[PDB]
Amino acid sequence: RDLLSKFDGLIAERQKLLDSGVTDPFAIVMEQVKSPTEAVIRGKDTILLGTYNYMGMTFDPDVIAAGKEALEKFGSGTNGSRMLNGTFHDHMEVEQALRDFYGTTGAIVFSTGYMANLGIISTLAGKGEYVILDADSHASIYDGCQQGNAEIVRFRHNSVEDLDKRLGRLPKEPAKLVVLEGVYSMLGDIAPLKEMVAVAKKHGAMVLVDEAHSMGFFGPNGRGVYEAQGLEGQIDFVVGTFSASVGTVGGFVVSNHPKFEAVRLACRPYIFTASLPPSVVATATTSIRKLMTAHEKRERLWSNARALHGGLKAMGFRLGTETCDSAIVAVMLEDQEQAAMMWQALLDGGLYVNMARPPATPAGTFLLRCSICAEHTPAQIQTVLGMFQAAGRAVGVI
Amino acid sequence: RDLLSKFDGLIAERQKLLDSGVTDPFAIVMEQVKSPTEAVIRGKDTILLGTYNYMGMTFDPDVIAAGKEALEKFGSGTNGSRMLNGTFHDHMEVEQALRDFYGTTGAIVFSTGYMANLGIISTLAGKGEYVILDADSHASIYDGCQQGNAEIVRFRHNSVEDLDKRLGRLPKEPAKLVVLEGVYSMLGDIAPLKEMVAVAKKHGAMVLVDEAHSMGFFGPNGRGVYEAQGLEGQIDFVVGTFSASVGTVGGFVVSNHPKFEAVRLACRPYIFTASLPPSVVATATTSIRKLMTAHEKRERLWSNARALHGGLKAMGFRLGTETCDSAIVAVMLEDQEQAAMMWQALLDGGLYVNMALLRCSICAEHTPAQIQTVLGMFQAAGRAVG
């Protein structure tokens, strides 16, 4: 035995999957990527329906031009932390783009979304304080709790009552952070933020909302579920990513708190890593600014989401949501095996979707996560729906 | 009071600094960057001597061409985890470049170096196991220990004897990870890896070495201090970064362990984050391959290091190292105050260094003329500050 013996279970789970005849779902390679919606996988032209490119920004000509120009003018990397030599023109620009996008005085960019959550949660809530989070919070949120020294309180997913009951039992004086997501990434449901935030404030807690899966397509300015639900000015901190709608890599937190800049001085995952390459922050700047007025894309996104959700529901699939609440549609299957055969059939027929099992999914569920984007065509959506009906019938799901 | 009241002390410390008239060292902006060694800061043409661009790869024409081509062919981002839709052609290419660079069967890329250390440490060592690390280990290594559930054992900096004593007191059966750095980033001194690794193996521990500050310029193949000290085949895991010599962003771990691929299945900071943009992994691929044979750059790096270290030493500065052992030269000062006045004077005269000590790092693309300029700037500022 050595330090890797602990992986023998995972190794066996993967091998069972291979031996059953399934392609390794964790080893897919996009050999070519033609557009936000099309790739080539093992020589097969394939529709992509398992990405977070909600607004199809990764091939935008202005975004690409900005990335090429930044490479030319500032090089391939910064070779330093933001706190030392790693803040270039474009890092300042992207933080201002966020201030403009969210209408906040404060914006701090991190090198990944994972690190934004890891850092913000572990830095804000210290020893003798509390972090109160939804059961279905992203892994990075749980990891931030593990990194910090605060008391952790989990409440039942989307339960306003359970949040209220668990908060009410805590001592009043210690400071508290309630952590919520606008759109939950596994099932594609939304949080009842209006009601949750009222409960948080009643118990004197600050509120952080993760709007990674809503950017550009919820609320009048595209700021997120919090904005759609009328909570402008009541959310202490909003966390997001550059990897989804924005189409690059990186994380961020925005706020109107007057002391928010001091987070830079204290936050280890901000301090102890190199800043993002100039091309990454330049592409992100251009993309964020275009997202402020991307009305046509937003309308195509919602039309595509409604088409997919409605179509899969009508044909008999059990979905994660009863109504079309986001750009993620989760098809729920009975077991690992049924999910795998479904996934394989779609893949072999020219459609890529995400297959998920826990820890990435809520315990016990086995699902296919489909996500649409603004650049899927009506023809592609009709193709996807047909592929799902045929595969669902063949595997015996519907 | 709220969750940010805890920062009132830091806020006051920063404000005292500003009120004293002195430039905020944590708010420097490189408004223009002309080359690996030259920037414009507050309108002033400034020599950079405080970066980790050791091999000056960030403006390499082949690297830049590869980044432009990747943007063109694959777009600005992947929009997904490596475990799902985020593995494109260039992610596979960069992992193979690492296998070729290090001569290993295994190579796993992470979205940052910080996350490579956070993830590898917290995933390898579980409950009832031990992580044994040098007192002066990088923050990311400490953070990996905090993230995991293992027992943590810290040993006195650079002390082979203390490592041996602390290991000897532990129970034999539980698995153990000894974590070392090749080049220590503050002072620029080197670990006695040959001796430390012998001790680790005597006590049955696995060994991880961080070679972030040695890549391309230690050992016959540029693999690091471990390679230079004859430890090829004896190091279980090597961790590095894409942000220093490689000149982009990202982290990695390499290994010959036959189960190494299974780390992908278990490691949370690998799984639960988007993969790097195509341009980042393409630039990294090209840079890594060039680093395998970058003889002219390596020679300039070492010549520059020797010139700077020798010059500052001869001038009467106390340095972190008695001999020129790495590309980092640390000038040691008495006070927070003396360091700050020194730093300010260098900055105002057209030279950027890191204040932590003043940490000077040379790169392969500094010219002999620039090094002589730096030396003059140091003498003048050192005399002016006393």
Side-chain angles (χ1 to χ4, degrees):
Chain A
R1 293 190 76 81
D2 63 16
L3 297 168
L4 288 86
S5 299
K6 63 171 63 55
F7 306 136
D8 284 344
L10 294 164
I11 286 165
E13 291 171 32
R14 177 185 169 271
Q15 189 59 55
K16 171 177 179 163
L17 198 68
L18 299 178
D19 289 349
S20 75
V22 177
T23 305
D24 183 353
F26 306 136
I28 296 292
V29 180
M30 308 304 178
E31 206 62 62
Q32 298 173 46
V33 176
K34 302 186 177 185
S35 77
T37 64
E38 301 165 283
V40 185
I41 304 174
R42 287 197 179 253
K44 175 77 172 172
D45 287 350
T46 301
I47 295 163
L48 293 172
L49 196 70
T51 86
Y52 295 129
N53 202 5
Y54 298 118
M55 293 290 279
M57 298 305 290
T58 54
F59 287 86
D60 181 275
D62 298 311
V63 170
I64 295 299
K68 287 181 186 170
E69 178 178 342
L71 276 159
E72 174 78 358
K73 283 188 161 35
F74 289 90
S76 64
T78 65
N79 318 93
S81 170
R82 292 289 304 274
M83 292 296 268
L84 291 175
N85 59 297
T87 302
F88 293 8
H89 175 73
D90 289 304
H91 302 82
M92 300 299 288
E93 284 297 304
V94 75
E95 283 175 343
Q96 190 57 43
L98 288 165
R99 289 190 194 89
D100 293 343
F101 188 93
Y102 289 97
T104 58
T105 53
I108 298 171
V109 165
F110 289 77
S111 297
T112 64
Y114 177 100
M115 289 166 81
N117 273 325
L118 187 82
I120 200 74
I121 290 170
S122 63
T123 305
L124 288 179
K127 194 166 165 98
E129 296 177 330
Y130 295 82
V131 183
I132 305 102
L133 77 170
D134 189 282
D136 288 3
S137 293
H138 192 255
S140 65
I141 293 168
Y142 276 97
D143 284 7
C145 293
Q146 172 63 29
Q147 186 60 213
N149 298 130
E151 300 299 305
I152 311 308
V153 178
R154 304 190 284 133
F155 69 89
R156 178 192 293 123
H157 179 61
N158 265 15
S159 183
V160 175
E161 175 161 73
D162 200 48
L163 173 66
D164 192 10
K165 303 296 183 208
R166 292 171 179 280
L167 281 167
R169 288 168 190 162
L170 302 176
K172 301 287 169 33
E173 257 206 278
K176 302 176 181 72
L177 187 62
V178 168
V179 180
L180 307 169
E181 299 187 17
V183 173
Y184 288 90
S185 61
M186 40 206 105
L187 298 180
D189 55 336
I190 62 160
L193 295 181
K194 176 184 168 65
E195 293 82 7
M196 297 282 194
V197 166
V199 163
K201 283 186 190 296
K202 182 179 69 167
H203 294 281
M206 306 196 84
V207 178
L208 169 67
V209 183
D210 184 325
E211 298 282 5
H213 293 284
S214 59
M215 190 183 192
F217 55 102
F218 285 84
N221 294 288
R223 297 167 182 165
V225 178
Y226 81 95
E227 197 203 3
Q229 294 185 10
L231 306 174
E232 196 59 82
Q234 299 194 65
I235 307 305
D236 300 285
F237 319 100
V238 175
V239 59
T241 181
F242 289 172
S243 310
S245 297
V246 176
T248 77
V249 77
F252 64 85
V253 185
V254 297
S255 185
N256 282 318
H257 199 286
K259 298 179 183 170
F260 188 63
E261 281 289 297
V263 167
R264 298 190 203 270
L265 302 174
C267 187
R268 287 171 69 87
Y270 178 83
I271 294 161
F272 291 105
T273 199
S275 66
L276 291 166
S279 69
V280 167
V281 288
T283 56
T285 301
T286 298
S287 184
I288 290 162
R289 293 195 175 290
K290 289 193 81 170
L291 288 170
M292 291 178 79
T293 60
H295 308 285
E296 288 176 9
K297 278 168 179 287
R298 176 169 174 163
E299 288 311 303
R300 290 195 287 278
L301 178 166
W302 280 109
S303 175
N304 289 342
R306 283 187 305 258
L308 189 61
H309 193 279
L312 296 181
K313 180 184 185 56
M315 70 180 60
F317 286 106
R318 182 160 73 82
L319 305 183
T321 47
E322 282 189 30
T323 55
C324 179
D325 304 331
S326 78
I328 291 153
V329 184
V331 173
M332 316 189 90
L333 302 148
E334 301 191 334
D335 46 42
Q336 175 151 152
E337 196 179 19
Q338 195 180 54
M341 287 322 160
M342 262 301 273
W343 178 82
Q344 185 70 53
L346 295 169
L347 191 75
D348 289 338
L351 179 61
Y352 177 83
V353 300
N354 300 149
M355 175 162 62
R357 49 171 311 171
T361 59
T365 73
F366 298 93
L367 54 98
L368 301 179
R369 183 175 70 266
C370 312
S371 34
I372 56 70
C373 90
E375 300 302 325
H376 279 114
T377 63
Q380 288 175 313
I381 296 306
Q382 284 189 321
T383 298
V384 165
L385 287 169
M387 287 178 180
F388 260 97
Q389 189 178 160
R393 277 162 105 176
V395 176
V397 183
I398 56 177
Chain B
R1 270 190 82 84
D2 63 17
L3 296 169
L4 287 87
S5 297
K6 63 172 62 55
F7 307 133
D8 285 344
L10 294 165
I11 285 165
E13 181 172 32
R14 179 183 115 80
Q15 190 60 53
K16 201 196 222 197
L17 248 72
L18 298 178
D19 289 350
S20 75
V22 81
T23 312
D24 182 353
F26 306 137
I28 298 292
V29 180
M30 310 302 176
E31 196 52 36
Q32 296 184 79
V33 176
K34 303 186 177 185
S35 79
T37 63
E38 300 165 283
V40 186
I41 304 173
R42 199 174 146 81
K44 176 77 171 173
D45 284 352
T46 300
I47 294 165
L48 293 172
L49 198 70
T51 85
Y52 295 126
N53 200 8
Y54 299 114
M55 294 290 278
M57 297 304 291
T58 54
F59 286 85
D60 181 273
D62 298 313
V63 169
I64 291 173
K68 290 179 187 170
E69 178 179 69
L71 277 160
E72 175 68 34
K73 285 186 169 342
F74 291 92
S76 63
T78 66
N79 317 96
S81 171
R82 292 290 304 282
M83 293 296 269
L84 290 174
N85 59 298
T87 302
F88 294 9
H89 174 75
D90 287 309
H91 300 82
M92 299 298 291
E93 287 295 306
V94 76
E95 283 177 343
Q96 190 58 42
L98 288 166
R99 290 189 194 91
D100 293 344
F101 188 95
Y102 289 96
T104 57
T105 54
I108 296 171
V109 166
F110 289 78
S111 296
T112 64
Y114 175 100
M115 287 166 80
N117 275 321
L118 186 82
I120 200 72
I121 292 170
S122 64
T123 304
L124 287 179
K127 188 187 147 133
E129 296 177 329
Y130 297 83
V131 183
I132 305 102
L133 77 170
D134 187 284
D136 291 3
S137 294
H138 193 256
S140 63
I141 291 168
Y142 275 98
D143 283 7
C145 291
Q146 172 62 29
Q147 188 65 26
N149 298 129
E151 301 300 305
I152 311 309
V153 178
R154 302 179 44 188
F155 68 90
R156 268 199 310 267
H157 177 63
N158 223 35
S159 183
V160 174
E161 172 161 71
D162 200 50
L163 172 67
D164 192 8
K165 305 295 184 209
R166 303 275 191 121
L167 282 167
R169 289 167 189 166
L170 304 176
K172 299 285 250 282
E173 205 231 296
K176 302 176 183 72
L177 187 61
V178 167
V179 180
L180 307 169
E181 300 187 23
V183 170
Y184 307 131
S185 62
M186 171 179 72
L187 297 179
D189 56 334
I190 308 310
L193 293 181
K194 177 184 168 66
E195 293 82 7
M196 296 194 158
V197 166
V199 163
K201 283 186 189 297
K202 181 178 69 166
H203 294 284
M206 308 196 81
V207 177
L208 167 68
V209 183
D210 187 324
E211 298 281 7
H213 295 282
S214 59
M215 190 183 193
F217 57 102
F218 284 82
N221 291 285
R223 296 166 181 167
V225 179
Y226 80 95
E227 196 201 2
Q229 295 187 7
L231 307 174
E232 197 59 81
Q234 298 195 65
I235 306 306
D236 301 285
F237 318 99
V238 174
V239 58
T241 180
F242 289 174
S243 66
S245 297
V246 176
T248 183
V249 76
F252 65 84
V253 185
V254 297
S255 184
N256 285 317
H257 197 287
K259 297 182 182 171
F260 190 62
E261 282 290 294
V263 168
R264 296 191 203 271
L265 303 174
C267 187
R268 288 171 69 87
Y270 179 81
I271 295 162
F272 292 105
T273 197
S275 68
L276 292 166
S279 70
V280 168
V281 287
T283 54
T285 301
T286 298
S287 183
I288 290 162
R289 291 196 174 289
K290 289 193 82 169
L291 288 169
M292 292 179 78
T293 58
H295 159 266
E296 286 89 72
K297 280 169 177 289
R298 179 168 176 162
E299 289 308 301
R300 289 195 287 278
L301 177 165
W302 280 108
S303 176
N304 290 340
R306 287 182 214 117
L308 188 60
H309 193 280
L312 295 179
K313 180 184 186 57
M315 210 172 275
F317 287 104
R318 182 159 73 82
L319 306 182
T321 49
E322 297 273 7
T323 55
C324 178
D325 305 330
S326 78
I328 292 152
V329 183
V331 173
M332 315 190 89
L333 303 148
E334 302 195 322
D335 309 342
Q336 170 83 312
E337 199 100 21
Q338 196 181 53
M341 280 188 69
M342 207 58 263
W343 178 81
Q344 185 70 54
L346 294 171
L347 193 74
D348 290 337
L351 180 61
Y352 177 81
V353 300
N354 288 324
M355 175 161 62
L357 313 181
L358 302 179
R359 281 173 68 266
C360 311
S361 35
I362 56 69
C363 90
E365 300 301 325
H366 282 113
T367 64
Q370 286 175 311
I371 297 307
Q372 297 305 310
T373 296
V374 164
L375 288 167
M377 289 175 178
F378 261 97
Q379 189 183 79
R383 275 165 177 172
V385 177

mmCIF file of all heavy atoms in Angstrom, chain A residues 176-204:
data_model
loop_
_atom_site.group_PDB
_atom_site.id
_atom_site.type_symbol
_atom_site.label_atom_id
_atom_site.label_comp_id
_atom_site.label_asym_id
_atom_site.label_seq_id
_atom_site.Cartn_x
_atom_site.Cartn_y
_atom_site.Cartn_z
ATOM 1 N N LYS A 176 -22.284 36.212 10.497
ATOM 2 C CA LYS A 176 -22.753 35.083 9.707
ATOM 3 C C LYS A 176 -22.799 35.418 8.220
ATOM 4 O O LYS A 176 -23.218 36.518 7.833
ATOM 5 C CB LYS A 176 -24.152 34.719 10.170
ATOM 6 C CG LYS A 176 -24.257 34.366 11.661
ATOM 7 C CD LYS A 176 -25.696 34.106 12.087
ATOM 8 C CE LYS A 176 -25.800 33.788 13.581
ATOM 9 N NZ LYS A 176 -25.573 34.992 14.438
ATOM 10 N N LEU A 177 -22.388 34.453 7.399
ATOM 11 C CA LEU A 177 -22.489 34.524 5.950
ATOM 12 C C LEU A 177 -23.425 33.438 5.426
ATOM 13 O O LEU A 177 -23.124 32.255 5.568
ATOM 14 C CB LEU A 177 -21.100 34.303 5.307
ATOM 15 C CG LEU A 177 -21.035 34.510 3.787
ATOM 16 C CD1 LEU A 177 -21.394 35.943 3.394
ATOM 17 C CD2 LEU A 177 -19.657 34.164 3.247
ATOM 18 N N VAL A 178 -24.501 33.841 4.767
ATOM 19 C CA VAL A 178 -25.400 32.937 4.069
ATOM 20 C C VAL A 178 -24.978 32.895 2.604
ATOM 21 O O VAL A 178 -24.819 33.950 1.976
ATOM 22 C CB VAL A 178 -26.874 33.394 4.213
ATOM 23 C CG1 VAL A 178 -27.809 32.643 3.273
ATOM 24 C CG2 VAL A 178 -27.326 33.202 5.658
ATOM 25 N N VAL A 179 -24.762 31.689 2.086
ATOM 26 C CA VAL A 179 -24.266 31.471 0.727
ATOM 27 C C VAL A 179 -25.309 30.750 -0.120
ATOM 28 O O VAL A 179 -25.775 29.688 0.237
ATOM 29 C CB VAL A 179 -22.965 30.626 0.713
ATOM 30 C CG1 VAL A 179 -22.452 30.411 -0.719
ATOM 31 C CG2 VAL A 179 -21.882 31.284 1.560
ATOM 32 N N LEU A 180 -25.650 31.344 -1.262
ATOM 33 C CA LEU A 180 -26.713 30.868 -2.130
ATOM 34 C C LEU A 180 -26.215 30.867 -3.583
ATOM 35 O O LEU A 180 -25.266 31.575 -3.913
ATOM 36 C CB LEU A 180 -27.937 31.801 -1.994
ATOM 37 C CG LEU A 180 -28.488 32.069 -0.582
ATOM 38 C CD1 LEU A 180 -29.505 33.200 -0.545
ATOM 39 C CD2 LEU A 180 -29.084 30.817 0.021
ATOM 40 N N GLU A 181 -26.840 30.069 -4.428
ATOM 41 C CA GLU A 181 -26.652 30.160 -5.889
ATOM 42 C C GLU A 181 -27.907 30.677 -6.538
ATOM 43 O O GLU A 181 -29.014 30.357 -6.084
ATOM 44 C CB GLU A 181 -26.273 28.803 -6.497
ATOM 45 C CG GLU A 181 -24.973 28.282 -5.933
ATOM 46 C CD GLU A 181 -24.454 27.031 -6.598
ATOM 47 O OE1 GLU A 181 -24.867 26.642 -7.727
ATOM 48 O OE2 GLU A 181 -23.622 26.412 -5.946
ATOM 49 N N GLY A 182 -27.771 31.472 -7.592
ATOM 50 C CA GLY A 182 -28.956 31.919 -8.346
ATOM 51 C C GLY A 182 -29.508 30.750 -9.140
ATOM 52 O O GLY A 182 -30.673 30.397 -8.992
ATOM 53 N N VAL A 183 -28.652 30.142 -9.967
ATOM 54 C CA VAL A 183 -28.989 28.937 -10.731
ATOM 55 C C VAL A 183 -28.027 27.854 -10.282
ATOM 56 O O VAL A 183 -26.829 28.089 -10.258
ATOM 57 C CB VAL A 183 -28.755 29.144 -12.244
ATOM 58 C CG1 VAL A 183 -28.929 27.842 -13.017
ATOM 59 C CG2 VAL A 183 -29.677 30.213 -12.780
ATOM 60 N N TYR A 184 -28.552 26.703 -9.884
ATOM 61 C CA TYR A 184 -27.768 25.555 -9.433
ATOM 62 C C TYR A 184 -27.327 24.757 -10.640
ATOM 63 O O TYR A 184 -28.146 24.436 -11.492
ATOM 64 C CB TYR A 184 -28.608 24.713 -8.456
ATOM 65 C CG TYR A 184 -28.742 25.462 -7.164
ATOM 66 C CD1 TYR A 184 -29.788 26.343 -6.941
ATOM 67 C CD2 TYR A 184 -27.737 25.375 -6.198
ATOM 68 C CE1 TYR A 184 -29.844 27.080 -5.762
ATOM 69 C CE2 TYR A 184 -27.787 26.117 -5.021
ATOM 70 C CZ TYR A 184 -28.845 26.963 -4.802
ATOM 71 O OH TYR A 184 -28.876 27.727 -3.634
ATOM 72 N N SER A 185 -26.042 24.424 -10.701
ATOM 73 C CA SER A 185 -25.459 23.893 -11.927
ATOM 74 C C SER A 185 -25.831 22.449 -12.281
ATOM 75 O O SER A 185 -25.776 22.097 -13.455
ATOM 76 C CB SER A 185 -23.943 24.036 -11.896
ATOM 77 O OG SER A 185 -23.405 23.312 -10.819
ATOM 78 N N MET A 186 -26.201 21.617 -11.317
ATOM 79 C CA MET A 186 -26.545 20.217 -11.617
ATOM 80 C C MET A 186 -27.942 20.106 -12.236
ATOM 81 O O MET A 186 -28.083 19.666 -13.383
ATOM 82 C CB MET A 186 -26.492 19.352 -10.357
ATOM 83 C CG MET A 186 -26.660 19.407 -9.723
ATOM 84 S SD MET A 186 -25.850 18.445 -8.433
ATOM 85 C CE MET A 186 -24.804 19.694 -7.687
ATOM 86 N N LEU A 187 -28.966 20.513 -11.487
ATOM 87 C CA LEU A 187 -30.355 20.378 -11.933
ATOM 88 C C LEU A 187 -30.896 21.528 -12.771
ATOM 89 O O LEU A 187 -31.904 21.374 -13.443
ATOM 90 C CB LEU A 187 -31.298 20.191 -10.734
ATOM 91 C CG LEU A 187 -31.092 18.950 -9.865
ATOM 92 C CD1 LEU A 187 -32.112 18.952 -8.736
ATOM 93 C CD2 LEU A 187 -31.219 17.692 -10.698
ATOM 94 N N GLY A 188 -30.251 22.680 -12.745
ATOM 95 C CA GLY A 188 -30.724 23.822 -13.550
ATOM 96 C C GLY A 188 -31.923 24.547 -12.947
ATOM 97 O O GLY A 188 -32.610 25.290 -13.650
ATOM 98 N N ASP A 189 -32.161 24.339 -11.647
ATOM 99 C CA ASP A 189 -33.188 25.070 -10.931
ATOM 100 C C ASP A 189 -32.641 26.378 -10.385
ATOM 101 O O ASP A 189 -31.423 26.587 -10.350
ATOM 102 C CB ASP A 189 -33.846 24.212 -9.820
ATOM 103 C CG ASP A 189 -32.861 23.615 -8.812
ATOM 104 O OD1 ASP A 189 -31.673 23.420 -9.100
ATOM 105 O OD2 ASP A 189 -33.323 23.304 -7.687
ATOM 106 N N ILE A 190 -33.547 27.263 -9.976
ATOM 107 C CA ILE A 190 -33.156 28.516 -9.394
ATOM 108 C C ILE A 190 -33.517 28.557 -7.923
ATOM 109 O O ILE A 190 -34.399 27.864 -7.457
ATOM 110 C CB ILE A 190 -33.762 29.738 -10.105
ATOM 111 C CG1 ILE A 190 -35.294 29.757 -10.035
ATOM 112 C CG2 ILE A 190 -33.279 29.786 -11.545
ATOM 113 C CD1 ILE A 190 -35.868 31.131 -10.284
ATOM 114 N N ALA A 191 -32.827 29.410 -7.195
ATOM 115 C CA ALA A 191 -33.111 29.598 -5.773
ATOM 116 C C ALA A 191 -34.228 30.625 -5.606
ATOM 117 O O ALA A 191 -34.370 31.535 -6.413
ATOM 118 C CB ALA A 191 -31.865 30.063 -5.068
ATOM 119 N N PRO A 192 -35.041 30.487 -4.546
ATOM 120 C CA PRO A 192 -35.984 31.521 -4.134
ATOM 121 C C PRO A 192 -35.251 32.593 -3.342
ATOM 122 O O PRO A 192 -35.403 32.752 -2.125
ATOM 123 C CB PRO A 192 -36.981 30.737 -3.285
ATOM 124 C CG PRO A 192 -36.150 29.669 -2.652
ATOM 125 C CD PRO A 192 -35.122 29.294 -3.675
ATOM 126 N N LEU A 193 -34.407 33.324 -4.047
ATOM 127 C CA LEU A 193 -33.550 34.322 -3.405
ATOM 128 C C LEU A 193 -34.319 35.402 -2.644
ATOM 129 O O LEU A 193 -33.890 35.815 -1.577
ATOM 130 C CB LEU A 193 -32.643 34.984 -4.444
ATOM 131 C CG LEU A 193 -31.609 34.096 -5.121
ATOM 132 C CD1 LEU A 193 -30.784 34.916 -6.091
ATOM 133 C CD2 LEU A 193 -30.699 33.434 -4.116
ATOM 134 N N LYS A 194 -35.445 35.859 -3.188
ATOM 135 C CA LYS A 194 -36.206 36.928 -2.545
ATOM 136 C C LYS A 194 -36.530 36.527 -1.107
ATOM 137 O O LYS A 194 -36.320 37.301 -0.168
ATOM 138 C CB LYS A 194 -37.477 37.195 -3.348
ATOM 139 C CG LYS A 194 -38.427 38.216 -2.749
ATOM 140 C CD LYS A 194 -39.672 38.291 -3.602
ATOM 141 C CE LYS A 194 -40.779 39.061 -2.910
ATOM 142 N NZ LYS A 194 -40.379 40.475 -2.735
ATOM 143 N N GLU A 195 -37.039 35.300 -0.964
ATOM 144 C CA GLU A 195 -37.471 34.788 0.331
ATOM 145 C C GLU A 195 -36.271 34.438 1.211
ATOM 146 O O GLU A 195 -36.273 34.723 2.403
ATOM 147 C CB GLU A 195 -38.389 33.569 0.174
ATOM 148 C CG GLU A 195 -39.746 33.860 -0.468
ATOM 149 C CD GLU A 195 -39.712 33.933 -1.984
ATOM 150 O OE1 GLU A 195 -38.676 33.637 -2.604
ATOM 151 O OE2 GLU A 195 -40.743 34.276 -2.595
ATOM 152 N N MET A 196 -35.237 33.826 0.630
ATOM 153 C CA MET A 196 -34.051 33.446 1.400
ATOM 154 C C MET A 196 -33.315 34.668 1.956
ATOM 155 O O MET A 196 -32.810 34.633 3.069
ATOM 156 C CB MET A 196 -33.063 32.633 0.540
ATOM 157 C CG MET A 196 -33.525 31.294 0.003
ATOM 158 S SD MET A 196 -33.455 30.071 1.288
ATOM 159 C CE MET A 196 -33.623 28.569 0.332
ATOM 160 N N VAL A 197 -33.225 35.721 1.155
ATOM 161 C CA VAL A 197 -32.501 36.926 1.535
ATOM 162 C C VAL A 197 -33.250 37.643 2.676
ATOM 163 O O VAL A 197 -32.627 38.134 3.609
ATOM 164 C CB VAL A 197 -32.238 37.846 0.315
ATOM 165 C CG1 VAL A 197 -31.792 39.239 0.737
ATOM 166 C CG2 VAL A 197 -31.194 37.200 -0.590
ATOM 167 N N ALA A 198 -34.566 37.702 2.586
ATOM 168 C CA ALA A 198 -35.375 38.253 3.683
ATOM 169 C C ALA A 198 -35.105 37.501 5.009
ATOM 170 O O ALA A 198 -34.912 38.126 6.062
ATOM 171 C CB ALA A 198 -36.849 38.208 3.329
ATOM 172 N N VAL A 199 -35.048 36.172 4.951
ATOM 173 C CA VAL A 199 -34.726 35.367 6.138
ATOM 174 C C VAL A 199 -33.311 35.610 6.656
ATOM 175 O O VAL A 199 -33.090 35.805 7.855
ATOM 176 C CB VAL A 199 -34.940 33.871 5.854
ATOM 177 C CG1 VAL A 199 -34.228 33.004 6.882
ATOM 178 C CG2 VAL A 199 -36.431 33.576 5.818
ATOM 179 N N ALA A 200 -32.336 35.644 5.750
ATOM 180 C CA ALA A 200 -30.968 35.973 6.121
ATOM 181 C C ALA A 200 -30.874 37.316 6.843
ATOM 182 O O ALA A 200 -30.238 37.422 7.890
ATOM 183 C CB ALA A 200 -30.075 35.994 4.887
ATOM 184 N N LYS A 201 -31.527 38.336 6.293
ATOM 185 C CA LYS A 201 -31.452 39.688 6.872
ATOM 186 C C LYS A 201 -32.163 39.778 8.215
ATOM 187 O O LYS A 201 -31.739 40.530 9.090
ATOM 188 C CB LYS A 201 -32.013 40.736 5.907
ATOM 189 C CG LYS A 201 -31.039 41.070 4.773
ATOM 190 C CD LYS A 201 -31.543 42.213 3.908
ATOM 191 C CE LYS A 201 -30.701 42.393 2.647
ATOM 192 N NZ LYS A 201 -29.286 42.778 2.920
ATOM 193 N N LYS A 202 -33.242 39.023 8.370
ATOM 194 C CA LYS A 202 -33.963 38.964 9.634
ATOM 195 C C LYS A 202 -33.051 38.474 10.756
ATOM 196 O O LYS A 202 -33.146 38.956 11.877
ATOM 197 C CB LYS A 202 -35.175 38.044 9.512
ATOM 198 C CG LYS A 202 -36.016 37.960 10.778
ATOM 199 C CD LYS A 202 -37.206 37.061 10.551
ATOM 200 C CE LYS A 202 -36.768 35.616 10.386
ATOM 201 N NZ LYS A 202 -37.929 34.702 10.466
ATOM 202 N N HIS A 203 -32.165 37.525 10.442
ATOM 203 C CA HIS A 203 -31.246 36.960 11.414
ATOM 204 C C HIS A 203 -29.897 37.672 11.415
ATOM 205 O O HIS A 203 -28.975 37.224 12.097
ATOM 206 C CB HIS A 203 -31.044 35.459 11.164
ATOM 207 C CG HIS A 203 -32.275 34.641 11.383
ATOM 208 N ND1 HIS A 203 -32.707 34.276 12.640
ATOM 209 C CD2 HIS A 203 -33.161 34.108 10.510
ATOM 210 C CE1 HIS A 203 -33.806 33.554 12.528
ATOM 211 N NE2 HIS A 203 -34.099 33.430 11.244
ATOM 212 N N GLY A 204 -29.804 38.799 10.703
ATOM 213 C CA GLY A 204 -28.610 39.659 10.703
ATOM 214 C C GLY A 204 -27.413 39.148 9.913
ATOM 215 O O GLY A 204 -26.306 39.619 10.111
#
